[PDB]
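Attaching the record inline, Q. Sequence:
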Amino acid sequence: RFLDTWRWQNYFLLHHNADFIEELAVGDLKHGDTFDVTIYTGGKDTGIVKIYQLSGNENDEINLHRYKTIYDSGLKHNYGRFVTPITKAYNPGTYVAVMKLGENYYYGGSFKISK
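Structure, as predicted:
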């Protein structure tokens, strides 16, 4: 029930518009694990990664709900490092990591978070 500003807030639309990148495809995670990815982000924009939960009715226009916003915490030139712990605050379910870089969007496909 929290609002978000990114362009794609529905998984179907995200999957049919954003670019899939393997660096964001972490696989299934369990509470206690850590999300930690390094991605090339170029020479003119700095990326931001969000973890959204996929939930809702099939009729809902919005089925992506933001759980975390992650900033680049690395020191590597033209790359971004995005790290966040998978705590119990992430209710078991299906999630997706999305990166906004300038006006473009990237994602790692859906994955599960389990107890």
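The chain has one domain: 1-115. The domain at 1-115 is CATH 2.60.40.3720 (Immunoglobulin-like).

More tomorrow.
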